[PDB]
Design a protein around this ligand. Structure first.
Ligand SMILES: NC(=O)C1=CN([C@@H]2O[C@H](COP(=O)(O)OP(=O)(O)OC[C@H]3O[C@@H](n4cnc5c(N)ncnc54)[C@H](OP(=O)(O)O)[C@@H]3O)[C@@H](O)[C@H]2O)C=CC1
Ligand SMILES: NC(=O)C1=CN([C@@H]2O[C@H](COP(=O)(O)OP(=O)(O)OC[C@H]3O[C@@H](n4cnc5c(N)ncnc54)[C@H](OP(=O)(O)O)[C@@H]3O)[C@@H](O)[C@H]2O)C=CC1
Ligand SMILES: CN(Cc1cnc2nc(N)nc(N)c2n1)c1ccc(C(=O)N[C@@H](CCC(=O)O)C(=O)O)cc1
Ligand SMILES: CN(Cc1cnc2nc(N)nc(N)c2n1)c1ccc(C(=O)N[C@@H](CCC(=O)O)C(=O)O)cc1
Lengths: 503, 503
C-alpha cells in the first residue's frame, strides 16, 4: 500500500502529450522536473518504479534511467532478467505488484502514453497527478492526456516559467494545531470590529477561486483573484457621486513576476492592444482623447465628453480635451496647460527622461520615482490620477523592478489594465537601459468593486487560471517613444472568454 | 487520557496573578475569554471540569459557574454530594481521576492560584497554557504565576487589546500536504533566481522572532520583526558613496492596528518625545532646522550642516535652512522658496488644510492624499523626502486609517520612528475630525539594513514581543497645531532595553 503518482506534461487547452511518436516540445527544465520527481525517495536501499507503455518505451529510445526501475507494459516485448532496470509486464493491473511483492520499491510513477493514462485513471489506484501545463497549441497532437476525473482536486499551481519563449506551469492533483483556530474564533466573538481579524476575514469558499488549492497558490494571478475575493468578503458598502455603488477595503497589495512571464490575466481575455495604445499615449505625453478614439480605443470616452466636462466645473475644453493627465505629468510636470492642440515640448520637468538617465548612470540609487499626482492642477484636469506613483529598482543581477501606488483602483476593469500597463512600461524601460524585467508590486489604497460587476466578477472567480503568456520585443529601440504595436509579440496567451463589464 | 489546560491572566513582566485574595485588575473581556475557553466542548452531553485551590474558590466567592464542574483542592473543606457542580478533593494527583474514572467530562482546566499551578506544572499533567498578558506592573502582588517550563513553546500571540486604557494579549503554549513542499523545493533547485520563491525565501529559524509561533503571529509587531527577518534572509549587498554598506529588498509591506493599541515597538525602547517634536514641526509648515535643535532634537542636524550643504549644491543657504521638505510641501505645496525666516502665508496649496476640510465634509471621498514629493523642488531640498505619500480613509464606522509609501526606509532606526510618527499623526487628525484611529499600513520601496547593525538587529529578533502600549490624549484641541507634549499620555509601555545602534 505505497504511493502511486501520474507524471505528465500536456498542453493547457488541448491536453495533448505527443506527436508522431515524439514530444511536441523540447523544454529542458520539464525533463529535469521529471527526473527530480521520480528519483525523490527516502530510503537509500529502495528504488522508484516508472511504468510506461511500449510506445513510450520506444519514445525514449529504449534506454534505461539512472537510479530507477522502468516497468514496460507490452504484449510482445520479451522478458529477460539480464537487465534489472527494465521489467516487462503484460497488463497494467497485474504490473501493480510492486506494492504487494517487491519491498525494494518505495514509490511508483505512471508516465506512459494515453493507453496507460486512461487505464490508470479508471482503475482508482492513482493517488496523485503531477501535471506540467505547456502553453503550446499551434501544432497538432496524435496522443492526448485524458480528462482528469472529478475525484481529483488541484492542490498546487506553481508560478509561470519560460523556456524558448514557451510558458508552462507545474500542478499537483490529489484524490480527495486546532486549539489556535478555536481560540481565534472565540476572541472574535468577544470583540466585534475591535479585533482586526474580523475586519480582514478570509473569503468564504463560495467566492474563493479554486478553493482546493489552499497552500500552493504560487501562480501570481492569484494575487489579483484573492484581492478580488477579499473585497467580496469584507467590503463596505459605499454610495458615491452618481448611483454606481461600490464595496471598498483599504490598504492592499499584490505582486507579480516579470522575469519568466508577463502578468496578463488569463481568467478573462484582456484587450492588450488598447492597453498598449494608452501607454504609448501616456509616454508620448499626449493629452488628446481623439488620438485614442482614432485607434479603436474608448477607455477615455465617458470621462471626456461634453456632458462630463461641464458638470465637474469645466466646460471650456474641446470635445475630448482632458487636462493635465498621465503623461503630461510624466513628461511635463507642473507647467501651464492651455489646450490639447498645442506642443508642450520643453515645458515643465521631464520625469521620464530623468528616470531613464538615472537608471543608466546611477542604478543603485533610491530616487527612481515617477509621480503623476499634482495637487496644483487637480481641479483643471478631467479626472484625478489613479496611478499616482511608481518607483523603480535595479537589482544586483541587472533586473528592473517596479512599485506602483494607486489611490484608486476598480478591480473589475482598472486593475487588469494597470498591471499590464506598468509591466509593459517596466519592460520597455528595461530594454532601453540595458536591463532585464524584474518584479512588479502594486500597492492599492481604496480597492473597490462596483455593484454592477458582482455577477460578472463572481464568474471570473469560478475559472481556474492558466499559465501567463510571454511578452517579447522584436527589435531593439533607441528611445522609449519609438515603441509601436508591431514590435510586440504576445506568445502563448490562452485566456478564458471575455467578460463584458460596462463602465 | 483527556486534555488538561492551564488558564491564567498574569502581568507581562512580573507574572503576578493576585493581590490580597483578589484580582489586581478588572478586565471584563478577560473574564469573557475565561468563560468561552472553559465552556468550549464538542459533546453536548458532557461537561468541562475546572480545578482550583480553596483560596481561589474563596476568591470567586464560592459561587458555581454555569454548565461547568468546579473541582476544589482543599484539606479542610467537607465533601457532600448535595451539589454536583462543586466537588472537593484532598490532593491534585487524586483529583485527576476525571480522565481515568469519569466518562461524563470532556476537558479539564487548571485555574487556581500558584499552589495549584506549581503542582500541575511539576507533575506533567498540563498539555496547554492559555495566558493573558496584562500590562500592569505598578501595583504589587502576593501570588504569582510560576515560570513556564522549557517543554512548552508559544504557538499563538493575539493582537493587543484595550480595556480602560489597560493593554493585554492572549497567548497559547503547548508542550512538545507533504508532496507540495517537496515539489516546491525540487522546483527551487532546477530554477535558481528564476523562481521568485528563491528570491523571497522564508527566513531561517535562527533569524525568525519566536519561531515556535508558526501560525498565530497575530501581534502586529511581527509585521516589523518578520520584515526585519526577510531583509536578513535575502537582502542584497549594496555598496554606496563611502563604505557604509546596506542590504536591500524591494517592495515590502507592514500594517498595524490603532483601534486598540499604539504600535510602539516593545522589542526595544523607542524614544517617543523626539518623534513627537518633529511631527508638530512638520504640521506647522516650518523649514528652519534651528527650531528642532532648540528642543533637544537632532534628527535634521547632520543633514543641515555646512558640510552637507556643500555637496548637494545649496551652499548659499543659512546655517540651518533645510528648505522645501515635509511640511512645506504639506502646507505650501509648489509656490517658491526664499529663505527659512520669511512669511509663506497664502502661497501654494495647503494640502493639510484641504485634507482636514475634505475629511469632515467629504468622508466617502477618495482624494484624501497628502504628498511631499515635488519633482520641481527636488534639487532644492537638503534631503529628498522619504515619506513621499500618505493617503487617509474614513471607514463606515467613523474610523480614520492611513496608508504610507516610503521610497527608502532604514529598518534599524527609521521604521520604528516612522511607524510611531505617522500613528500619532493619524490619531491627531482623527481627534480634530471627530473620528477614532483605524489601521496603519506602511508600503516600503527600498527596505534596507545597514551592515553595522547586524549583531544588534539579531538581538532584537531574539526577544519575544510584549503587548503594545496605549497612547491617549488628555485634552481636546481645536486646531491640529495646538498639540503639545503635555497632552500625550503613554500608558503601559514595558519595552525591552534600548539597543544603541550608531549611524
Ligand atoms: N508529454 C508527456 O508527458 C508524455 C508523452 N508521451 C508521448 O506519447 C506517445 C506515446 O504514447 P502512446 O501512443 O499513447 O502509446 P503508449 O505509451 O500508451 O503505449 C502503448 C503500447 O503499450 C502496450 N499496451 C498498452 N495497453 C496495454 C494493455 N492494456 N495490455 C497490454 N499491452 C498494452 C501496447 O504495446 P504492444 O504493441 O506491445 O502490445 C501498446 O501498443 C509518444 O509520442 C510519447 O512521446 C509519452 C509519455 C509522456
Ligand atoms: N490572575 C489569575 O488568572 C488568577 C488569580 N488568582 C488569584 O490568586 C490568589 C489565590 O491563589 P493562591 O493564594 O495561590 O491559593 P490557591 O488558589 O493556590 O489555593 C490554595 C489552597 O488550596 C489548597 N491546597 C493548595 N495546595 C495543596 C496541596 N498540595 N494539597 C492539599 N491542598 C492544597 C490549600 O487549602 P487548604 O487551606 O485546605 O490547605 C490552599 O490553602 C487570589 O488572589 C486569586 O484572586 C487565582 C486564580 C487565577
Ligand atoms: C517518458 N518520457 C516522455 C516524457 C517527457 N516529459 C515529461 N514531462 C513530465 N512532466 N511528465 C512526463 N511523464 C514526461 N514524459 C521521458 C522520460 C524521461 C526522459 C529523460 O530524458 N530523462 C532524463 C532527464 C535528463 C535531464 O536531466 O534533463 C533522466 O535522466 O531522467 C525523456 C522522456
Ligand atoms: C478563578 N477566577 C479568577 C480568574 C480571573 N481571571 C482569569 N483570567 C484568565 N485568563 N485565566 C484565569 N484562570 C482567570 N482566573 C475567576 C473565574 C471566573 C470568574 C467569573 O466571573 N466567570 C464568569 C464570567 C462572566 C462573564 O461572562 O463575563 C463565568 O460565567 O464564567 C471570575 C474569577
Amino acid at each position: 500500500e505505497k504511493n502511486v503518482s501520474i507524471v505528465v506534461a500536456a498542453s493547457v487547452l488541448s491536453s495533448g502529450i505527443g506527436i508522431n511518436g515524439q514530444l511536441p516540445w523540447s523544454i529542458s527544465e520539464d525533463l529535469k522536473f521529471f527526473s527530480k520527481i521520480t528519483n525523490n525517495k527516502c530510503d537509500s536501499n529502495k528504488k522508484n518504479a516508472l511504468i510506461m507503455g511500449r510506445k513510450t518505451w520506444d519514445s525514449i529510445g529504449r534506454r534505461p534511467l539512472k537510479n530507477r526501475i522502468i516497468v514496460v507494459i507490452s504484449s510482445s516485448l520479451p522478458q529477460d532478467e539480464a537487465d534489472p532496470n527494465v521489467v516487462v509486464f503484460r497488463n497494467l493491473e497485474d504490473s501493480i505488484e510492486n506494492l504487494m511483492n517487491d519491498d525494494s520499491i518505495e514509490n511508483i510513477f505512471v508516465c506512459g502514453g494515453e493507453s496507460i493514462y486512461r487505464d490508470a485513471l479508471k482503475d482508482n489506484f492513482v493517488d496523485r497527478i503531477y501535471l506540467t501545463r505547456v502553453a503550446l497549441e499551434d501544432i497538432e497532437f496524435d496522443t492526448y492526456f485524458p480528462e482528469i476525473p472529478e475525484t481529483f482536486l488541484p492542490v498546487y499551481m506553481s508560478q509561470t516559467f519560460c523556456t524558448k519563449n514557451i510558458s508552462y506551469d507545474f500542478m499537483i492533483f490529489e484524490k480527495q494545531l486546532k486549539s489556535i483556530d478555536d481560540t481565534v474564533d472565540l476572541l472574535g466573538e468577544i470583540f466585534g470590529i475591535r479585533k482586526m481579524g474580523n475586519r480582514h476575514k478570509f473569503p468564504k469558499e463560495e467566492i474563493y477561486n479554486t478553493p482546493s488549492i489552499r497552500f500552493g497558490r504560487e501562480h501570481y494571478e492569484f494575487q489579483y483573484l484573492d484581492l478580488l475575493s477579499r473585497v467580496l468578503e469584507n467590503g463596505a458598502y459605499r454610495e458615491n457621486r452618481t448611483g454606481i455603488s461600490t464595496y471598498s477595503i483599504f490598504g492592499q497589495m499584490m505582486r507579480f513576476d516579470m522575469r519568466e512571464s508577463f502578468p496578463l490575466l488569463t481568467t478573462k481575455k484582456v484587450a492588450i492592444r488598447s492597453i498598449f495604445e494608452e501607454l504609448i499615449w501616456f509616454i508620448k505625453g499626449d493629452t488628446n482623447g481623439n488620438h485614442l478614439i482614432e485607434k479603436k480605443v474608448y477607455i477615455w470616452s465617458g470621462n471626456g465628453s461634453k456632458e462630463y466636462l461641464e458638470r465637474i466645473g469645466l466646460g471650456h475644453r474641446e470635445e475630448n480635451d482632458l487636462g493635465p493627465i498621465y503623461g503630461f505629468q510624466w513628461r511635463h510636470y507642473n507647467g501651464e496647460y492651455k489646450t490639447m492642440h498645442d506642443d508642450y515640448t520643453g515645458v515643465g520637468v521631464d520625469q521620464l527622461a530623468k528616470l531613464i538617465e538615472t537608471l543608466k548612470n546611477n542604478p543603485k540609487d533610491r530616487r527612481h520615482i515617477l509621480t503623476a499626482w499634482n495637487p496644483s492642477a487637480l481641479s483643471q484636469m478631467a479626472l484625478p490620477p489613479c496611478h499616482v506613483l511608481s518607483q523603480y529598482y535595479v537589482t544586483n543581477d541587472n533586473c528592473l523592478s517596479c512599485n506602483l501606488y494607486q489611490r484608486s483602483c476598480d478591480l473589475g476593469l482598472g486593475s487588469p489594465f494597470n498591471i499590464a500597463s506598468y509591466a509593459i512600461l517596466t519592460m520597455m524601460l528595461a530594454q532601453v537601459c540595458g536591463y532585464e524585467p524584474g518584479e512588479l508590486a502594486i500597492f492599492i489604497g481604496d480597492a473597490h468593486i462596483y455593484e454592477n460587476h458582482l455577477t460578472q466578477l463572481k464568474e471570473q472567480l469560478s475559472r481556474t487560471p492558466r499559465p501567463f503568456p510571454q511578452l517579447k520585443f522584436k527589435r531593439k529601440v533607441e528611445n522609449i517613444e519609438d515603441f509601436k504595436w508591431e514590435d510586440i509579440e504576445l506568445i502563448g496567451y490562452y485566456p478564458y472568454p471575455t467578460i463584458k463589464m460596462d463602465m
